């Protein structure tokens, strides 16, 4: 069995900038979800080899995890907040697509997604 390479977190060809919205996404949103008791399955790519999930990367074609998001934010990989918000929504969506309702990992994603929603509701206006 083999894992795919992870999503890129560095690419000099990609336009990027610092925004106050991206600063919020690191200092408030990522920091809140990372420290949560349910963060740990989401803090690095799914290891489909060690978890014995040989179908995972047949069903999940756009993988994403908060380890990737954290490096993207710390490396200033994004152009705008919408790109980073899309990564969070991909991560949650992938968990719901692969798993079934009421599975423990779905309850964990739901608890993280509720905090995510509460924090991005107060995303600051761009300066
Ligand atoms: C490190 C990761 S990543 C990750 C899991 C783990 C352990 C993780 C997980 C699981 C439980 C907790 Cl508390 C927590 C997490 N889940 C995986 C998906 C997965 O293994 N599915 C297989 C089954 C796991 C269980 C339940 C069903 C019946 C049995 C036993 C097999 C399905 C997964 N998906 N998305 C992500 C992200 N994960």
Nearest atom in ligand 1 to 65's CA = 37
Q: Cα–Cα distance between 19 and 76 in angstroms, integer?
A: 10
Residue 85 lies in a domain: yes
Return the best residue to mutate from 36, 39, 41 for the ligand 1 pocket (most ligand atoms within 8 A of CB).
41
Q: Which domain holds residue 24?
A: 19-123
Residue 96 lies in a domain: yes
Residue 77 lies in a domain: yes
Sign of torsion over alpha carbons 75, 80, 84, 86: negative
The count of structural domains within the chain is 1
Q: Cα–Cα distance between 29 and 70 in angstroms, integer?
A: 10
Residue 11 lies in a domain: no
- Please, which experimental method was used? X-ray
57: CB partners within 8 A, 6+ apart: 3, 4, 46, 48, 63
Of 95, 77, 93, nearest to 25 by C-alpha is 77
The experimental resolution of this structure, in angstroms, equals 1.5
């Amino acid at each position: 069995s083999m894992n795919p390479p992870p999503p890129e977190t560095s690419n000099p060809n990609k336009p990027k900038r610092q925004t106050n919205q991206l600063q919020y996404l690191l200092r408030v949103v990522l920091k809140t979800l990372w420290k949560h008791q349910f963060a740990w399955p989401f803090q690095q790519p799914v290891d489909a080899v060690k978890l014995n999930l040989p179908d995972y990367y047949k069903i999940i074609k756009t993988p994403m995890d908060m380890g990737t998001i954290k490096k993207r934010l710390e490396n200033n990989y994004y152009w705008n907040a919408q790109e980073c918000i899309q990564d969070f929504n991909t991560m949650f969506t992938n968990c719901y697509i692969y798993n079934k309702p009421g599975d423990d990992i779905v309850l964990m994603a739901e608890a993280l997604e509720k905090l995510f929603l509460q924090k991005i509701n107060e995303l600051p206006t761009e300066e």
